[PDB]
Design a protein around this motif. Structure first.
Motif, PDB file in Angstrom:
ATOM      1  N   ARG A 147       0.807  -1.198   0.000  1.00  0.00           N
ATOM      2  CA  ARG A 147       0.000   0.000   0.000  1.00  0.00           C
ATOM      3  C   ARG A 147       0.864   1.283   0.000  1.00  0.00           C
ATOM      4  O   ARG A 147       0.337   2.391  -0.309  1.00  0.00           O
ATOM      5  CB  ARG A 147      -0.972   0.072   1.197  1.00  0.00           C
ATOM      6  CG  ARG A 147      -2.054  -1.045   1.170  1.00  0.00           C
ATOM      7  CD  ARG A 147      -3.274  -0.872   2.091  1.00  0.00           C
ATOM      8  NE  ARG A 147      -2.867  -0.921   3.460  1.00  0.00           N
ATOM      9  CZ  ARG A 147      -2.869  -2.045   4.245  1.00  0.00           C
ATOM     10  NH1 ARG A 147      -3.248  -3.293   3.875  1.00  0.00           N
ATOM     11  NH2 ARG A 147      -2.519  -1.911   5.484  1.00  0.00           N
TER      12      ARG A 147
ATOM     13  N   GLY B 246      -6.323  -1.621   4.631  1.00  0.00           N
ATOM     14  CA  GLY B 246      -6.054  -1.724   6.066  1.00  0.00           C
ATOM     15  C   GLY B 246      -7.279  -2.074   6.882  1.00  0.00           C
ATOM     16  O   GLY B 246      -7.178  -2.767   7.882  1.00  0.00           O
TER      17      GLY B 246
ATOM     18  N   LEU C 124      -1.155   3.686   8.407  1.00  0.00           N
ATOM     19  CA  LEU C 124      -0.104   3.456   7.431  1.00  0.00           C
ATOM     20  C   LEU C 124       1.112   4.308   7.835  1.00  0.00           C
ATOM     21  O   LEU C 124       0.969   5.514   8.082  1.00  0.00           O
ATOM     22  CB  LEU C 124      -0.632   3.772   6.024  1.00  0.00           C
ATOM     23  CG  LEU C 124       0.345   3.402   4.881  1.00  0.00           C
ATOM     24  CD1 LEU C 124       0.720   1.910   4.870  1.00  0.00           C
ATOM     25  CD2 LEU C 124      -0.409   3.783   3.593  1.00  0.00           C
TER      26      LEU C 124
ATOM     27  N   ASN D 250      -2.186   8.825   3.610  1.00  0.00           N
ATOM     28  CA  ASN D 250      -3.612   8.892   3.871  1.00  0.00           C
ATOM     29  C   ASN D 250      -4.049  10.252   4.363  1.00  0.00           C
ATOM     30  O   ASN D 250      -5.071  10.387   5.035  1.00  0.00           O
ATOM     31  CB  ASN D 250      -3.986   7.762   4.841  1.00  0.00           C
ATOM     32  CG  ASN D 250      -4.137   6.431   4.122  1.00  0.00           C
ATOM     33  OD1 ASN D 250      -4.623   6.355   2.981  1.00  0.00           O
ATOM     34  ND2 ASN D 250      -3.674   5.366   4.752  1.00  0.00           N
TER      35      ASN D 250
ATOM     36  N   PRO E 187      -4.757   5.209  -0.176  1.00  0.00           N
ATOM     37  CA  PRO E 187      -4.754   3.749   0.103  1.00  0.00           C
ATOM     38  C   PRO E 187      -5.869   3.282   1.054  1.00  0.00           C
ATOM     39  O   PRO E 187      -6.349   2.115   0.946  1.00  0.00           O
ATOM     40  CB  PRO E 187      -3.299   3.454   0.630  1.00  0.00           C
ATOM     41  CG  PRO E 187      -2.541   4.716   0.410  1.00  0.00           C
ATOM     42  CD  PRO E 187      -3.415   5.826   0.006  1.00  0.00           C
ATOM     43  N   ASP E 188      -6.268   4.171   1.976  1.00  0.00           N
ATOM     44  CA  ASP E 188      -7.290   3.769   2.984  1.00  0.00           C
ATOM     45  C   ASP E 188      -8.701   3.835   2.442  1.00  0.00           C
ATOM     46  O   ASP E 188      -9.637   3.567   3.222  1.00  0.00           O
ATOM     47  CB  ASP E 188      -7.115   4.583   4.313  1.00  0.00           C
ATOM     48  CG  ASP E 188      -7.507   6.068   4.195  1.00  0.00           C
ATOM     49  OD1 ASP E 188      -7.886   6.463   3.091  1.00  0.00           O
ATOM     50  OD2 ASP E 188      -7.318   6.825   5.232  1.00  0.00           O
TER      51      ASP E 188
HETATM   52 CL   LIG Z   1      -3.979   2.197   4.259  1.00  0.00          CL
END
Ligand SMILES: [Cl-]
Ligand SMILES: Nc1ncnc2c1ncn2[C@@H]1O[C@H](COP(=O)(O)NP(=O)(O)O)[C@@H](O)[C@H]1O
Ligand SMILES: Nc1ncnc2c1ncn2[C@@H]1O[C@H](COP(=O)(O)NP(=O)(O)O)[C@@H](O)[C@H]1O
Ligand SMILES: [Cl-]
Ligand SMILES: [Cl-]
Ligand SMILES: [Mg+2]
Ligand SMILES: [Mg+2]
Lengths: 360, 360
Positions: free
Chosen positions: A86, A120, A191, B204, B216-217
Motif C-alpha cells: 500500500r 487496512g 499506514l 492517507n 490507500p485507505d
Molecule cells: Cl492504508
C-alpha cells in the motif's frame, strides 16, 4: 491427503517484512461457514514481496522458494498483500501482480484464485476474526468486548466492537455477520506507523538506543526509554492524531480484554523480556526496556545476547509500543495486554478462511 | 580515451532511489588538487542498491547493468552509499559490501578502491563542494555566503558557512581546506526526512493529494497545500526539531545565495511547475502546488499530464519542500532558491573527486 476429506485453501500473508504461506483444512457448518480450521502446511520467506525488484527473474525466484515442498497438489491460492504494497502507487503494484499472474500461469501445482492488495480496514477485520476464532468467541454472543491490535512493520491495526455510528466514516466500520450473529466493529489501520516505517524517523535519537550504540550519524546511543517514548508520541499524536481519533471512541466503547499479534509477540517472548502467561502490561514493558536494554553498554549487551537480530532495536521498540498503546490509544499502563505466542503462527489469514469478502 | 592524457576516476552515487555512475577526467594544479573536472560518462540504474535483496545473484545483476556499456575501462572505482544504506544496521550493510567486493574481485575491467557507506556529514560536505565547484567559488576567498541544500529520498542535507563555534558538536562543523583557502562550514543531514521516507507518513492525508485521488485507505484526496504543509511541519519540528537546531544558526550566519539539488530540481523543471532562470521562491512553489495540483480533479489532471510518474505526489512534495525550507530551516518564503538543472547530472560525487578524506 487431508484435502480429499476436508476443504483446503492456501492463503499468503504478503506482509511488509516477509510472506507466510498457510494451507488450511476445514469443515463447514450448516450455513457453509468454516469450522475445525487447521493449518496443515506453512512456509515463510523474507524479505517482503513489495520490497523486491518487480522483474520476472526476481519474482520467479521468490515465488518458487515460497511455494516449494508442499505435499498436496492443485490447492487454490489467495495471495493478499498488506501495507508494504500500500506504500506504492497502483501503477507500481500492477507490475508486481502482472509478473505474479504470469508466474502462476506457467506452472501446474497451484491454482491462483486471487492476488491483490487488501485495505487496512480488510486487514483489521481479518486480524479481529483470526484472534476471536482462536479464542472461540465467534459462535455465540459475547458479554465482553474483545479488542485486537496487530503490530506490523508498515501499518498497525486496532479493531474493537462499536455500534454503528453515523458520525464516523463508513470506511472505519464493519458490520460482520459470522455464525448467524451480527457484530459491528470499529476498524482503523495506521499506514507508516508500523515498526519499520516508524523506526526510520528515530535512528539518530540517542534516547532510543543502548549506551554507545553507533548511530548512523556518528553519535552514540544514550538510552532513556521515557524520553524515546515521548519522541515516538510526537509522531503518534502531533503528526497522526492517533489520540484524537481513537481515545474518544474507546472511552464510550470500552474494551474488556486486549489481544495483540505482530512484532510485540516476538519481543515479549524473546530472551531479553520476561513476562508470564503470554501477557504484559505497558508499564512493565517500558520499565524492562529501559533497564534491560536502554541503559546497558551496547558492546557488553550485544556480547551477552548474540543470537537475536532485533536486540539493537529493543529500547526503541519497547518505547514505541508504549507510545502507541498508552499515549496513542489511551490504554492504561497497568491494563493486561495478552499477546499470542509466536509459535502458533497466527496471522490475519485465518480471517480470510472465515470471511471471503473485501471492501469494494 | 581521455584517461590516457588526464587522471580519471569512477564515482558511484549509490543513492536511496538509484545508483549513478560517473566517470570524471581531470587535471591537477601545483598542490595535486583537481581542476578541469569533466564528466565523460554517466549511467543511472534504479532502484536503490540498499533496497534490493543482498544475494550474489541479484547484486551481480545490478552491478553488471550499472557498469556495462561503459566506454572506458581500467579505472579506479569509489562506490559510496548514502541514506538508503544508513537505514540498515551495520551487519546488514556488511552483506551488501561482502557481495559487492566479491563481484569486483571476479572481474578485470574496473579497479575497486573503496565501497562504503558515507555519513550524512560527509555527504553534506560533498554537496557543498560539488555546487561551489560548478559555481567557480572555490579558488578564491568569497565575500558572499553560499548555502546548499540536497533534497534526497532518504535524507536531506543543509550546509552553509559558519565560523567555528565551541558550543556546537564538532560532528556538525567541518573546516575545509581547498585550493589553499580554509572554509568553516556547518553541516547537517536529517535521516528519515528525505522524500520517500517522509512520504510514508502522509499517504492517507487528504490535504496532500489532488481532489478525488484514491488514497490507500479508501478515502479521497481533498488537496490543500497550506494544510498539507502544516502536517509535514509537525514531522519537521514536533518530531525532528529541525527549527530548533537550524534557525538560530542561520539567523546569525545569513546565507546570501541558496542553491538546491535533488528532487526539487526535477519537480521545479517539470511540465507542472513554471519557473524562470532555474530559481524559485517558496511562496511561489506552494501557490503553484496548491492551485496546479492540490485543488485539481485527479482524473482530469492525470489525463492531461500522462507522462510524469511523480504527478500524483506533487501536491505533497511542493508542501513538503516549503515545510522543510520555511518552517524547518527558517528561510523567508520570498527568498530566491536556485536549483541546478537536472540535465547537468550534478550530484555530490564531484566533491569526492576534489576531497578524498571521509569522517573517521
Ligand atoms: Cl492504508
Ligand atoms: N523479535 C522481534 N521483536 C520485535 N518485532 C519483531 C520481532 N520479530 C519480528 N518482528 C516484527 O514483526 C512485524 C511483522 O509485520 P509484517 O506482517 O511483516 N508487516 P505488515 O505487512 O503487517 O505491516 C515486523 O515489523 C517485524 O520486524
Ligand atoms: N520529478 C521529480 N519530482 C520530485 N522529486 C523527484 C523527481 N524525480 C526524482 N525525484 C527524487 O529525487 C530524490 C533523489 O534522491 P536520492 O539521491 O535517490 N536519495 P538519497 O540517497 O540522496 O537520500 C528522490 O527522492 C527521488 O524520488
Ligand atoms: Cl531484489
Ligand atoms: Cl545519518
Ligand atoms: Mg502483518
Ligand atoms: Mg542523493
Amino acid at each position: 491427503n487431508p484435502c480429499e476429506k476436508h476443504s483446503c485453501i492456501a492463503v499468503i500473508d504478503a506482509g511488509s517484512t516477509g510472506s507466510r504461506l498457510h494451507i488450511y483444512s476445514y469443515d463447514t457448518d450448516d450455513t457453509n461457514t468454516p469450522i475445525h480450521i487447521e493449518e496443515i502446511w506453512n512456509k515463510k520467506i523474507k524479505p517482503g514481496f513489495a520490497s523486491i525488484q518487480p522483474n520476472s527473474v526476481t519474482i520467479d525466484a521468490y515465488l518458487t522458494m515460497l511455494l516449494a515442498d508442499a505435499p498436496i497438489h492443485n490447492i487454490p491460492v489467495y495471495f493478499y498483500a498488506t501495507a508494504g504494497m500500500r506504500l506504492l502507487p497502483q501503477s507500481q503494484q500492477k507490475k508486481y501482480y502482472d509478473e505474479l499472474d504470469y508466474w502462476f500461469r506457467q506452472q501446474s501445482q497451484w491454482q491462483l484464485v486471487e492476488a491483490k492488495t487488501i485495505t487496512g480496514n480488510d486487514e483489521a477485520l481479518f486480524d479481529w476474526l483470526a484472534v476471536n476464532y482462536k479464542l472461540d468467541t465467534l459462535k455465540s454472543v459475547q458479554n465482553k468486548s474483545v479488542g485486537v491490535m496487530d503490530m506490523g512493520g508498515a501499518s498497525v491495526q486496532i479493531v474493537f466492537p462499536m455500534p454503528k455510528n453515523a458520525e464516523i466514516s463508513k470506511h472505519n466500520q464493519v458490520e460482520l455477520n459470522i455464525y448467524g450473529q451480527n457484530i459491528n466493529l470499529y476498524v482503523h489501520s495506521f499506514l507508516g506507523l508500523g515498526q519499520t516505517e516508524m523506526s526510520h524517523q528515530f535512528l539518530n535519537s540517542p534516547s532510543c538506543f543502548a549506551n554507545d550504540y553507533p548511530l548512523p550519524d556518528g553519535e552514540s546511543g544514550q538510552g532513556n526509554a521515557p524520553s524515546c517514548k515521548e519522541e515516538v508520541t510526537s509522531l503518534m499524536n502531533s503528526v497522526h492524531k492517533v489520540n484524537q481519533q481513537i481515545q474518544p471512541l474507546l472511552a464510550l466503547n470500552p474494551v474488556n480484554e486486549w489481544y495483540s499479534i505482530g512484532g510485540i509477540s516476538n519481543l515479549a517472548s524473546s530472551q531479553l523480556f520476561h513476562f508470564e502467561n503470554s501477557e504484559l502490561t505497558n508499564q512493565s514493558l517500558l520499565q524492562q526496556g529501559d533497564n534491560q536494554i536502554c541503559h546497558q553498554q551496547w558492546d557488553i549487551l550485544n556480547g551477552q545476547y548474540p543470537d537475536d537480530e532485533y536486540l539493537y532495536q529493543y529500547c526503541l521498540l519497547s518505547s514505541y509500543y508504549y507510545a502507541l498503546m498508552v499515549d496513542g490509544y489511551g490504554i492504561n499502563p497497568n491494563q493486561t495486554i495478552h499477546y499470542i505466542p509466536p509459535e502458533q503462527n497466527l496471522d490475519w489469514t485465518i480471517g480470510v478462511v472465515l470471511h471471503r469478502a473485501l471492501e469494494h
